[PDB]
Design a binder for these strands. Structure first.
Lengths: 69, 136, 386, 224
RNA sequence: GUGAACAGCCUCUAGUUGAUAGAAUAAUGUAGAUAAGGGAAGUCGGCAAAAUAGAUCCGUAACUUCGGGAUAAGGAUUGGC
RNA sequence: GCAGUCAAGCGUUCAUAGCGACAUUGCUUUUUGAUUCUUCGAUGUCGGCUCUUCCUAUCAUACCGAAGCAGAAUUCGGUAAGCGUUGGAUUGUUCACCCACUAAUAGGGAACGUGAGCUGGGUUUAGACCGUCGUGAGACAGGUUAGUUUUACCCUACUGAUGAAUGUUACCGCAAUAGUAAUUGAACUUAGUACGAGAGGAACAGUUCAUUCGGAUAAUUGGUUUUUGCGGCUGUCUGAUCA
């Protein structure tokens, strides 16, 4: 059992949890829940939903000591 | 299953009843396939015999290069676009339906396959995996 | 005229009537066959269902596709307080069936057992087991004569037990008394084993074991009065039908001139007694066993309690049985765990495989975190605390 | 030599097996009869390895490599990666490849000296294949087919191509590959030659349905 | 007031607050609804529901009694400062 | 419609492997007839959808016997209905003919089962059109289009529920009786073995799955979402903001 990362939010997915979708480009996509899965279907840029991980990474949101080596 | 389908397949969700239209996945010149029946079905009043990933069915070409029409010809399902559960614990699905032309012996009339192919189909049918492209 | 097209019958005939159970606890109709060669041990057992959880284990089945590959399965953890014996009872054989001719009770029964006999506890004087329990003041010939009788007669012996209702995190405040037959040897030895097990624990270290096939007796969750479509599975009538599309069109032919008992009719649904056979145990844990959810591979620190506890159930701090698959009966209800009546040989049982990972995520929503440590680690500091 | 063997009932031996000059892989679901032919002549010369790449038994199409490397797709489990590392000798170095283009066996048609890749290969993967395999790679497709690995069964002593390949196409590769290529069929008329059967420097295994003179051709071209 | 509008929707003047009530709110109903994948395979018959459906720009065939068909068919935009 | 007996002959050679002329004995009440007994102060008339049970002259599955049964396939028969007998184009269709799956798509009864279960497609009032007949009003199993189908608040039967009386009350059990459930197929091995100069070609045992049915639940995926729980947007009204 390895660690797989959500494709839209970035939260860790436990076995038996989440969904999985394959696009026409044959590139993989994993969603932790219908909240993240349906949000992807609406073609939402995930850099703009506040509670995702890519949003907080972009705006150094709560980075604290992670910005320091 | 069916004749020539060596090995066994674990049951998955049925999402292709009689009368479905499936995109042509292989370079046989066809554009779509119209499922008329499935192999190894059951017998229940008012139940459409449905298909699934890796299953082999016969489907006419309602829209394609001419002499592939007006006749029945078997095919193999390579995409389902319907959420099915694997044993490993994943609920996955594809973007759209897709099938490949294949005579009853199990080999393919076409040469190549465009788009992802479910490994539940590659494993069950060796010749499909022989001419398959992306594998999940 | 015939049925035109012939279809399989809707529903089952042997599970009728689909009426309410006579008691909230499904009685054990039969017990595993006895052999007078083995040490004394219990045959059935009592527990409370708490919910389900998800597992991962390495499947070991030669010849299958998923050999030496990980899978996931559902398991229903059942709460288990240690069961204490408060009495024994002998069953004799008659040309009309087994009959109980005597009973023996323990010395100091807990308030739970006394509470069972009273419909109104507060108004009562707690005067139960007062005249009878005084018989121990003498040398004991009052009770020792009865235990002599169960040795001579009563070739079948069933021991009376009850659970601890206060140890379980449930608020019924009243125990569940029940009879449990024994699979020991010699009726003389069976009662002898009973004498020195009054007012003491009987854990799950002897009744069941890891990777054992057991039955599950419980009571169906109730859904009240139901129609005929969802009760049986009858086809829904077409949309154009007048005055109802959720019923059975033709009850019966002109003759016979009465409704057949085999016709499906609206009635009571749920609250049945269903015995599900051949259930396999994966975990047998103890309350004092810290990090129950940890496995030889995880090496983590967490119990089996999910985030926020089991829905409509407590926190679980005592013994438990973690059985593969679903189970009859709903949450907060007594569940009877009983030893398999037949020795299973299918190459599906006897698969002594340990688990690999246990789901402890929240069961009150979309459980995203297994332990508070990893929850606080992933998000980090919040506005609360520092 | 040339051995006639059926996996269960299918004649696609190359699909279910990968044969190289120092190691060989077979499906675990096979029977003694399929296993007997492989161990009949190999003996203890090179190890026999039982694996399931990608959780499936099409390892021949899901895996491709030579003396200097082995290729496994991303989704394969590390437990099987560890198993192949322990079973196979240390002389071969296994590095995972990140690519959703296709199964590696279909994409990669390589040998000790030369390699053939899928039309949609990317430069980042191009360097990874060359360094891992220690093999110079060139761009070309068998008869224009994208599945170069499934329509070309190749070894250091020769090579098989698509049966209906034009004569001009066949000779063009032979100059670069430095080995002759002969158009032909396998398994009683099947045009899938790259996946129908496999060749190493001392053996070639085909299906039991191969006719009389294709097996003779296989012996001639591959110098058995 | 929004709005093409005596359309729908909310309000000012004016007038009612009236047509048995209380509690849980089982089936089966009457009236509204929503359904993963396929999709008329259902049925005598897509009957019922569904989709487009306002406005601006582009574009529009067979045929004809040359007046029409024709907002045919088919495409692109619509908020706020 | 179904089942026998005799038996000339067919069956290379041989009456009964399988068939079988000329005659002849019966069975069936799902054909159609004939009768007219019940009912014209009236028992709602075709078909389709839904559902239950029963019978077998067994279509498939279980176990066997016979062959002009070497294997495979087939054909004939015995105990047997326990279980399963489908999805569609045309037609209102009973019927029928095709497409396809399947182990198989066997026949039937129960007021030609089933309208206070449904539909009203057809035949069957009244409107109207065409053809033939009639001088005419009108007639035709003719062809076609449009044509309101009502009530259970009773008793029994069935499906679920309560309940007095056998000193009271409570707990734990026995058991008569009644019902009963499982079902079929595919892939590998056996095994290019047995069997035959050749095409072909299995089976018992074992493993992995699946078809139909049944009972239970809800971790997981999906659905519903008056927790209006949260966020967003439109029109209007609280002077504006907030709400």
């Amino acid at each position: 059992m390895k660690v797989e990362i959500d494709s839209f939010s970035g939260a860790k997915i436990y076995p038996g949890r989440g969904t999985l979708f394959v696009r026409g480009d044959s590139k993989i996509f994993r969603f932790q829940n219908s909240k993240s899965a349906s949000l992807f279907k609406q073609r939402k840029n995930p850099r703009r939903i506040a509670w995702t991980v890519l949003f907080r990474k972009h705006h150094k949101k709560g980075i604290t000591e992670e910005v320091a080596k | 299953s069916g004749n020539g389908a060596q090995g066994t397949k674990f049951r998955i969700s049925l999402g292709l009843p009689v009368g479905a239209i499936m995109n042509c996945a292989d370079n046989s010149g066809a554009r779509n396939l119209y499922i008329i029946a499935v192999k190894g079905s059951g017998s229940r009043l008012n139940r459409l015999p449905a298909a699934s990933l890796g299953d082999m069915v016969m489907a006419t070409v309602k829209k394609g290069k001419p002499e592939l029409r007006k006749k029945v010809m078997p095919a193999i399902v390579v995409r389902q676009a319907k959420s099915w559960r694997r044993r490993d614990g994943v609920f996955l699905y594809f973007e759209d339906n897709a099938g490949v032309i294949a005579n009853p012996k199990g080999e393919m009339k076409g040469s190549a396959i465009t788009g992802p192919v479910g490994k539940e189909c590659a494993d069950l049918w060796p010749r499909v995996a022989s001419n398959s492209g992306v594998v999940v | 005229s015939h049925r035109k097209y012939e279809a399989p019958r809707h529903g089952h005939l042997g599970f009728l009537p689909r009426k309410r159970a006579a008691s909230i606890r499904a009685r054990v109709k039969a017990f595993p066959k006895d052999d007078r060669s083995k040490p004394v041990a219990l045959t059935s057992f009592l527990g409370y269902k708490a919910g389900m959880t998800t597992i991962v284990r390495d499947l070991d089945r030669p010849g299958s596709k998923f050999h030496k590959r990980e899978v996931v399965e559902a398991v229903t953890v059942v709460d288990t307080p240690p069961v204490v014996v408060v009495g024994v009872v002998g069953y004799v054989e008659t040309p009309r069936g087994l009959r109980s001719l005597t009973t023996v009770w323990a010395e100091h029964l807990s308030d739970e057992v006394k509470r069972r006999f009273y419909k109104n506890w507060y108004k009562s004087k707690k005067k139960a087991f007062t005249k009878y329990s005084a018989k121990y003041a003498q040398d004991g010939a009052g009770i020792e004569r009865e235990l002599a009788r169960i040795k001579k007669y009563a070739s079948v012996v069933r021991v009376l037990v009850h659970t601890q209702i206060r140890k379980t995190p449930l608020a019924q405040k009243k125990a569940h008394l029940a009879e449990i037959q024994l699979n020991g040897g010699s009726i003389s030895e069976k009662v002898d084993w009973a004498r020195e097990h009054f007012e003491k624990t009987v854990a799950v270290d002897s009744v069941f074991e890891q990777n054992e096939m057991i039955d599950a007796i419980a009571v169906t969750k109730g859904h009240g009065f139901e129609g005929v479509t969802h009760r049986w599975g009858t086809k829904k009538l077409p949309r154009k039908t007048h005055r109802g599309l959720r019923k059975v069109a033709c009850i019966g032919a002109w003759h016979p001139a009465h409704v057949m008992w085999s016709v499906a009719r609206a009635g009571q649904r749920g609250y049945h007694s269903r015995t599900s056979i051949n259930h396999k145990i994966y975990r047998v844990g103890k309350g004092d066993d810290e990090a129950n959810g940890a496995t030889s591979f995880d090496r983590t620190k967490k119990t089996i309690t999910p985030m926020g506890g089991f829905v409509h159930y407590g926190e679980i701090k005592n013994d438990f049985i973690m059985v593969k698959g679903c189970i009859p009966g709903n949450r907060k209800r007594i569940v009877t765990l009983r030893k398999s009546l037949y020795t299973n040989t299918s190459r599906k049982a006897l698969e002594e495989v340990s688990l690999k990972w246990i789901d402890t995520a929240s069961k009150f929503g979309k459980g995203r975190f297994q332990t508070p440590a990893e929850k606080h680690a992933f998000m980090g500091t919040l506005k609360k605390d520092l | 030599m040339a051995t006639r063997t059926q996996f269960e009932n299918s004649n696609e031996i190359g699909v279910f097996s990968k044969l190289t000059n120092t190691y060989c892989l077979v499906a675990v679901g096979g029977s003694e009869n399929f296993y007997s032919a492989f161990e009949a002549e190999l003996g203890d010369a090179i190890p026999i390895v039982h694996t399931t790449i990608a959780g499936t038994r099409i390892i021949g199409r899901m895996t491709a490599g030579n003396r200097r490397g082995l290729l496994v797709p991303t989704q394969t489990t590390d437990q099987e990666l560890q198993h192949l590392r322990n079973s196979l000798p240390d002389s071969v170095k296994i590095q995972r490849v990140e690519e959703r283009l296709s199964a590696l066996g279909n994409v990669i048609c390589c040998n000790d000296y030369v390699a053939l890749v899928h039309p949609d290969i990317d430069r980042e993967t191009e360097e990874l294949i060359s360094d891992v395999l220690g093999v110079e790679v060139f761009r070309q497709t068998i008869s224009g087919n994208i599945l170069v690995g499934s329509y070309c069964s190749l070894s250091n002593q020769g090579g098989l191509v698509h049966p209906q390949t034009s004569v001009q196409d066949q000779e063009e590769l032979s100059s670069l590959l430095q080995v002759p290529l002969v158009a032909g069929t396998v398994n009683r008329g099947s045009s899938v030659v790259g996946a129908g059967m496999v060749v190493n420097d001392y053996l070639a295994v085909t299906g039991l349905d191969t006719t009389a003179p294709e097996l003779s051709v296989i012996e001639s071209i591959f110098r058995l």
